[PDB]
Amino acid sequence: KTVRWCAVSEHEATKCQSFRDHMKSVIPSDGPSVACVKKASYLDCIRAIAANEADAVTLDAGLVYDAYLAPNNLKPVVAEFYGSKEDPQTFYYAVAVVKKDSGFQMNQLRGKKSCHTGLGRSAGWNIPIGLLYCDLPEPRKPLEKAVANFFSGSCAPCADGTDFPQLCQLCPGCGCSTLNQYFGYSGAFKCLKDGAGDVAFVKHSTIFENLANKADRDNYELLCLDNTRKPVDEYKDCHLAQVPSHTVVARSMGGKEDLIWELLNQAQEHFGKDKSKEFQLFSSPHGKDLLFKDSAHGFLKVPPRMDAKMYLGYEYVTAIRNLREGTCPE
Numbered sequence: 001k002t003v004r005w006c007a008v009s010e011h012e013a014t015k016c017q018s019f020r021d022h023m024k025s026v027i028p029s030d031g032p033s034v035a036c037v038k039k040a041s042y043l044d045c046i047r048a049i050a051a052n053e054a055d056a057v058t059l060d061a062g063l064v065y066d067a068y069l070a071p072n073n074l075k076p077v078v079a080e081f082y083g084s085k086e087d088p089q090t091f092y093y094a095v096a097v098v099k100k101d102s103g104f105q106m107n108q109l110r111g112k113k114s115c116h117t118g119l120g121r122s123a124g125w126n127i128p129i130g131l132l133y134c135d136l137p138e139p140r141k142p143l144e145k146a147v148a149n150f151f152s153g154s155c156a157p158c159a160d161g162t163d164f165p166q167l168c169q170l171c172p173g174c175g176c177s178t179l180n181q182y183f184g185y186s187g188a189f190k191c192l193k194d195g196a197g198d199v200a201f202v203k204h205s206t207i208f209e210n211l212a213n214k215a216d217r218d219n220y221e222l223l224c225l226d227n228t229r230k231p232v233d234e235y236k237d238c239h240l241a242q243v244p245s246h247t248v249v250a251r252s253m254g255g256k257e258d259l260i261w262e263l264l265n266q267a268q269e270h271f272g273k274d275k276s277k278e279f280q281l282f283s284s285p286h287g288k289d290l291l292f293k294d295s296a297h298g299f300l301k302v303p304p305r306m307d308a309k310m311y312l313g314y315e316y317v318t319a320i321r322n323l324r325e326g327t328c329p330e
């Protein structure tokens with residue numbers, strides 16, 4: 001009855017131990033417990049789970065494509081929901097955040113410096129790059145190199161800085177964890193805030209999570225598809241796409257999914273949004289989106305018959321498959 005959670009680097013491990021410890025106090029001795037496995041990146045976590053060294057890790061939907069392929073063969077078991085309990089959203093919006101008065105529109109992105117959440121993630125990579133690779137009559141389509149030559153420097157966490165130094169320009173090394181200050185949604189927004197990049201590819205709640213007062217948020221806007229900018233509150237009218245929720249994944253067979261659910265259900269019940277002043281499941285003095293997204297309000301069980309392809313949808317998986325092949329309509 002021990003769920004082995006795969007923590008990615010230092011901060012997550014810190015929060016995971018605090019997760020383990022607090023659960024120990026509200027769950028009966030015969031109930032599920034948490035064990036923490038620290039890994040270097042999400043990829044190691046996927047391998048560890050498939051190799052039966054850990055049992056669970058939360059992933060952005062785009063990374064669910066990787067966990068699914070053999071030899072990994074992982075499946076989503078618990079999805080995060082955003083918004084509220086009364087109105088649970090199992091999707092979010094990918095947006096392009098720029099500083100106010102920077103001048104460029106969606107079509108003048110070449111030559112800019114970009115800030116991405118991570119390589120392979122929905123909002124930070126799949127959505128934005130998906131939208132512009134084919135619009136490049138230039139067949140330098142083996143992605144990384146095309147992107148590396150499209151922008152004049154980026155921070156694409158988890159990318160290979162040895163073959164593509166340009167991709168790690170804004171964050172030397174392209175570290176794939178929170179140890180990289182420019183990692184994740186808030187890492188990418190910071191990359192723009194710090195003025196290291198001209199555009200951050202994040203989600204609609206990112207800025208709200210980072211800039212408390214409207215005053216500062218006014219120094220920012222969003223790039224829309226029709227080549228017009230708009231206020232950060234107009235994300236419903238100005239966003240790149242709607243993507244599925246981050247989901248906790250487990251092994252397709254012998255994945256301990258019941259235990260995973262009871263542990264998380266019990267956790268949201270005890271430390272969910274608003275629940276406890278002792279320990280918050282969706283926030284941490286040690287950082288943002290550690291283990292789960294700070295923007296989540298709870299967890300929902302994924303229907304048992306639902307596999308990765310059904311979870312992502314036909315359009316997304318195909319888009320992802322095509323993206324990684326540079327395939328573009330002839």
Ligand SMILES: [Fe+3]
Pocket residue numbers: 060061121122123246
């Ligand atoms: Fe995401």
